Design an enzyme around this catalytic site. Structure first.
Site, short mmCIF file in Angstrom:
data_model
loop_
_atom_site.label_atom_id
_atom_site.label_comp_id
_atom_site.label_asym_id
_atom_site.label_seq_id
_atom_site.Cartn_x
_atom_site.Cartn_y
_atom_site.Cartn_z
N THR A 78 0.89 -1.32 0.05
CA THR A 78 0.03 -0.02 0.04
C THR A 78 0.84 1.33 -0.14
O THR A 78 1.46 1.60 1.19
CB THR A 78 -1.14 0.14 1.11
OG1 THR A 78 -1.70 -1.10 0.94
CG2 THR A 78 -1.94 1.17 1.00
N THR A 79 1.03 2.07 -0.96
CA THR A 79 1.50 3.35 -1.12
C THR A 79 0.74 3.78 -2.40
O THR A 79 0.53 2.86 -3.41
CB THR A 79 2.96 3.42 -1.21
OG1 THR A 79 3.20 4.79 -1.21
CG2 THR A 79 4.01 2.78 -2.57
N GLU B 6 1.70 0.47 -5.94
CA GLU B 6 2.29 -0.82 -6.04
C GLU B 6 1.29 -1.76 -6.66
O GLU B 6 0.33 -1.08 -6.92
CB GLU B 6 2.69 -1.38 -4.61
CG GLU B 6 1.67 -0.99 -3.37
CD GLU B 6 0.25 -1.09 -3.63
OE1 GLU B 6 -0.45 -0.09 -3.95
OE2 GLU B 6 -0.22 -2.24 -3.59
N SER C 178 0.60 3.17 3.57
CA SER C 178 1.69 2.67 4.79
C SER C 178 3.03 2.45 3.98
O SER C 178 3.82 1.89 4.83
CB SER C 178 1.08 1.29 5.22
OG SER C 178 1.03 0.38 4.30
N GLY C 179 3.21 3.12 2.96
CA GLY C 179 4.58 3.13 2.35
C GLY C 179 5.14 4.90 2.08
O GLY C 179 6.25 5.11 1.58
#
EC number: 3.4.25.1
Lengths: 235, 202, 202, 235, 235, 235, 235, 202, 202
Positions: free
Chosen positions: I1-2, I17, I131-132
């Site tokens: 997740t980014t 991603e 979360s990246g």
């Protein structure tokens, strides 16, 4: 409003019946080897794409109906009959029987003449198939079903029936049955048949699969019938 | 609770314990747990006892109605598939019961298990279900032939339920049994089944 | 909460404890968990007095209504099934009250045990419910015969119920009993029962 | 509202069919390389801007549909076509076919004819599109559906259908086919076209995307067409 | 209620249009330099307050509409336009096009004409704004939409529209276009105008924000427009 | 029910206006110093206790309304109007303007004119208040909103308005205006008034509070009016 | 059903008033020391029991109502009134006042006027009570609500109103109001009353509660009235 | 996350923390938690970022709609109230925010705080709302006087907010301010504010 | 997740991603998480995968619907605000996804980040959910200058999610990128991106 006549008939229904007569003639013939259903692809111009006019609808894998009467009504009833057929399939995992398919769309048709808020159907169908013996039904715009051994709907209603009273032998083979219907149809429109002003479909017993006779396999049965249609329109 | 159902060359035989508990207490052993769906068709339940009772009445009422409506008895598959849809229709207030509905028609014999959350599978010959499945299937698989006769099957079917109900803490109070031989829809009753185990260890 | 119910050859008798287990609290002592549904037909309950009394009112009414409408006295099965459908409909409303509806009719005699989760089990002779179900049943089993007289059944019933009724002392005063003999829907009332079970002592 | 006639027709359908005759002619030419749909936006005043009035609507990315009848009904009917089209695309990730798109909007016209709550939609549409082969439909205010090779709805129907019966082929190539439908349009209004008085769209086969003919791109075809329109009219 | 006539017209739409005709004239004149939208206050006597009569309703913040017909039907359709116009800002964060809003209020008109439980509006609206180019629409009780470059509705319609076939030009100076629309108004009433018995607003191109002529600004334009009004009612 | 005529007028609206003609007269006279509203109770019998009879209804603290037509229709509309005025206060914490209260209920009337489920509200309401400056509106059965400044509804409309047409000055101190309105009423009924058989309410500029003028307080105005009433009815 | 006529009157309501006149009269006389409500419960046949049959129904404890017109329509309205008076006690913990009750059932009757799938109640009710001061009302099938000192509904309306126009006075002794009331009843039927075929109830100020005048206690008033009932028929 | 709002003697000045986080993480360069509702009205939100955005849009659309319909520009009270009744109707899909809606109208200057639990209250000349508010009240009210220019006030607002930002380890950077002067609705935006707070250092 | 997104002076570049896991089980690694909504307009999604693709289909259908209907392609703005309104109506049903809809339209270049409860925030600037994101946006900001080609923008976005990839392999290990230039809509797919990361080794 659909109300009573002082003759016990419904008027909207009698009127609907004339709409059925003024429609495009079809016709079913049953033998003990399957059941045929022929419907006249009606053409008024050379600018109709006539190869793409649907007059024999497939409804299940062993059921087909052709139609006579108002074309708009005819489809939705048929779209109805397609879901209904499948719904039987969905809940019982059987095929729907040809008689029960005829009941169920005729029960629908009844609602439309029960309630004075909406208009009746003006479509008759010939629902033919093989449940486990060949069947052929003529439904009425009232919504009532009658089993016929060979019958027609439309403008050939009387021409076809009259013909069958004399010609019909019962106890027929398919190849005979095929030609027999074609003669009855050619006489309806009172001229000689080409394969491309008729659509023809069938459910055989020995397969129980629906097939639409492409004009290639259709042409030989026409040819035999053009001889008998000619004979009769020259007496 | 434990069920079996046996598919045979001459019939269908099914068996279940008759323990039927309400709350968790056995009020009385004056119960059945084999319910008659059609003329030659049974339903045997594995799961909670409460769900099975009313549900048998509904499936049944629909099957006498289908016979009436279509002038023809329903097939094994029609009733089994209906029961699947029936379960899935009231799944807002779901019934948790694994019904083995099977019996006899013109196509032959079959037993269909139906799950509470979805579809109805056919079981080819052998079916069992419950917390006593594990033992009861264990009896079947070391003595089942596919040339198994109807009287033989009643002896085998009892033995499966018998062995299974001793081990569990949720199963007993006699064995219910049913032969569907398409000449009789015989229900062996407390009286008779008791003698088939009195050829065993009573 | 102990219920007994037994089908004789010549009567039908059922008994219950006066109040249910409510805890050390009591409300009234003209409370009863035994109600009359139709002329010769009762309903005995396991569960709450309140839940039992309200539902009983609905059933009595529908019974009375059944009677009037079809010019036929309802039979016990007719009410037991009627009550089965009310419960299944109301399974997510509070009616976990579990009923024995039995008595007497034209078709014969029974006691039907009706569940919140539906169905009806015809109890063919002996039936109990509750937490006192296992205790009370065992007493019955002991002297039951299918030829027991109506009075012997009364004597049996009071002894049997009185044993499980030992558990609560704020319900062991008063007893519910009913005689159904086709001529009397007799509900004894505390006083006339109390001299019978003076002999099995307070 | 809608009920049967004693002649087995429906009053409201028939008077609706008249609504279409009283509309502004449109017209379709189907050739093997596309389907061309030209509509008459020929205006009544010079203050009516004829460069921001629309009478050929895009319905999907390979379907365009023209209209005759009442303007208001058309717009709404076609809006329903645009939502039904995209709904198809949503549910099946496959763009809606011409026939099938036409069937759902015909069911909708049929619902409003069927039912007594509402009056029929008084419009005929020509749905043009290449599903995978060029297809040209005619939709009628009953909810009837007919496949044509070249057709017209509206004021010019009598002229235009008769014209194709005297000149139209099926090996008709795209340029000549554009001129045919522009020539035919000219006959309807009994005058030479003006590029500002017609709108033209075509779904091509090769592109399989609808693109509209520009006012710029109209001009070569209007020039050619006009030589043939003058020749016929001055006879 | 709403049914088709044997002409295939709607009895109630033609009657709705006559309803518009006994209304009170409005007029809209377009240029490339803005769009001018003018509506005639009704003054029947001197008890009528004539500083607080609505005849030009603002719909959205760069789109105004004028009205003629049944003032009651009209306001409700206008309130509905204002809600639709703001629903566009809520779901797309961009103002509605002048065309987009026009279609959306005519869906509202068209639904009522088709249903038999309700009667069409007897209102016509002129909806004029600038989304990036000046627009001017005229909507009909049917829910029909016609882009225009000059127009009138109401009683003066015929007089004014005929008038615009001589005078109107494609490009005009805004100060010219404003005066030309007061001249037309003057002509249709068959008398000189007073600044306070006529209403005028405009969306200009430079402002893209509806603004409305205060009585004083108006004042010079009435005065220049009075000279030509005098010439006309002499010839 | 409600449909247009060949002459474009809704028969139901036109007939509802005949109901308003057939009602007990009110009246509004607005000056710069506040707005007065006068309604005739009449006669009755002598058994009618016609000193408790309302005809001036307070809608809001700063708004009153009078009526003519059907009494029943009137009262129900006034209950909706009162609900509307308080709903504004509920949701915007500010009192409703006179225009928006009058507007909202005219939209409510328009709902009952287009729907064929109901027949119109046969009432005219005069909405008078001082919301930001004295305003007196008159409402019509359809929902025709028109702002007046001295007006009449009912059986006295023709007479009372002709009176106000010569005599109304815009200048008037509050006392000159009350006497003016009272004189007008007197000409309609063709006799001197009784202060108990008329009811006068007012919304004042200075108070911005509604007060209903009791027979004690109304007394000196009546006296100065019966002087003029008698005089003018001898001319 | 309910439509306006060109005479500005809802024809169905005018027909309902004729229904009232064909019902059995009731009458109400108001004094300083309470209100009395007398109603003719007179029977046409011997076998009809006149010892139980109501023509004075108790609504709230402070309020009574009498009725004339279709007993069936009345009884539903009165049952509504009973519920409605009680709804007031639910929500404000006070007894409803006489005006608010009569107004509320009138608002209810008015709805059924203007609702197209249902017909006006054919009833006039006389709602008498003492909420603080004496009140008497006459409602009408319109929805019309008028407070009266003394009145009648039904057969007796024209005769009795007229009779009161001379004999009724603004104040009376309770005992005198009672004899006057019963005289008016006898004049209307043009015969002498018996106590066993009139019903008289009241709501007094001092009691503030409703009691019903028992046949024994009816008696002396009827004899005192009898002398005058003859006197006026010998006049 | 704090907002201050202050009614000045010739306008309204209010401010917020621009700080918008998911954790503590800064996703974009701008996320204005200050909205222009009407031509000289603001809406500052302390509490959630995303819920604020959409909600502001509604109110804003209604403020425009108001103007068009009534031929009168909304007053501060009108928008402020409109919002309370809105939040209360729509508590089924609750927006958990403490707003401040204020600014300038014909009537003059005022700022109202609105609960999601409803009700619009009016704050006389100072209000602080947020987690940081208790700290904010401190700075704001010492140096606020009933007579304060709009210009003197912007310095004060930035200061009142700033006191909170240094205190939290989930704030530090970003500022909203709007001077509403009765001619302008100036939104100062990050760059211009920055030199205001390079007079109070760090 | 980014998701990352950057607004250049020559177009718009976004990246995401391919890999998002629920548990240790891999839900995708061949899914595109950049979708193309309208001709030169994309949607990029941080959150779960499933809801992102189903949602992109509806917004695509609606975008095509705006084009065909209004006779004018929809702005970036139009479709972002329409997604935001949908998300908000849809907060009873799973569509809790944080999306970046961006593209080119008549107004130039833009990317909107769309709050997951609905509520757009306009960026002419740069954005990351996920979360990246924490790392990526840092690296993104370092080599971004407002004078920037989309040639190098693709490099930068790859670089940024490479930083995100160091944390866990959940982010990266498959990466999509899009370049949009108002006459090219190029979705690279793994192979090409593998060479832009072959200049960065990994």
């Amino acid at each position: 409003i659909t109300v009573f006549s002082p003759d016990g008939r419904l008027f909207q229904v009698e009127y609907a019946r004339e709409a059925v007569k003024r429609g495009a003639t079809a016709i079913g013939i049953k033998c003990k080897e399957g059941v045929i259903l022929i419907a006249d692809k009606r053409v008024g111009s050379k600018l109709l794409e006539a190869d793409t006019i649907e007059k024999i609808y497939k409804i299940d894998e062993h059921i087909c109906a052709a139609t006579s009467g108002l074309v708009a009504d005819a489809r939705v009833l048929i779209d109805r009959a397609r879901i209904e057929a499948q719904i039987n399939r969905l809940t019982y995992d059987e095929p729907i029987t040809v008689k029960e398919l005829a009941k169920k769309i005729c029960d629908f048709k009844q609602q439309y003449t029960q309630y004075g808020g909406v208009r009746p159907f003006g479509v008759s169908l010939l629902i033919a198939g093989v449940d486990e013996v060949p069947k052929l039904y003529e439904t009425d715009p009232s919504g009532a079903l009658l089993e016929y051994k060979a019958t027609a709907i439309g403008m050939g209603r009387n021409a076809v029936t009259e013909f069958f009273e004399k010609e019909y032998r019962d106890d027929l083979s398919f190849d005979d049955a095929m030609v027999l219907g074609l003669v009855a149809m050619g006489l309806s429109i009172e001229s000689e048949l080409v394969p491309e002003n008729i659509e023809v479909g069938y459910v055989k017993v020995d397969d129980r699969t629906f097939k639409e006779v492409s004009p290639e396999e259709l042409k030989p049965y026409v040819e035999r019938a053009n001889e008998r249609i000619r004979e009769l329109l020259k007496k | 609770t434990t069920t079996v159902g046996l598919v045979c060359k001459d019939g269908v035989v099914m068996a279940t314990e008759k323990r039927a508990t309400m709350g968790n207490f056995i009020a009385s052993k004056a119960a059945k747990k084999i319910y008659q769906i059609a003329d030659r068709m049974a339903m045997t339940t594995a799961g909670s006892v409460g769900d099975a009772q009313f549900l048998a009445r509904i499936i049944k009422i629909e099957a006498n109605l289908y016979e009436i409506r279509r002038e023809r008895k329903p097939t094994v598959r029609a009733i089994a598939t209906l029961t699947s849809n029936l379960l899935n229709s009231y799944r807002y207030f779901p019934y948790l019961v694994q019904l083995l509905i099977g019996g006899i028609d013109s196509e032959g014999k079959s037993i269909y298990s139906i799950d509470p959350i979805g579809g109805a599978i056919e079981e080819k010959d052998i079916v069992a279900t419950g917390s006593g499945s594990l033992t009861a299937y264990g009896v079947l698989e070391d003595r089942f032939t596919p040339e198994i006769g109807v009287d033989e099957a009643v002896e085998l079917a009892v033995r499966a339920i018998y062995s299974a109900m001793k081990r569990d803490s949720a199963s007993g109070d006699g064995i219910d049994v049913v032969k569907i031989t398409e000449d009789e829809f015989y229900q062996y009753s407390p009286e008779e089944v008791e003698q088939i185990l009195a050829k065993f260890r009573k």
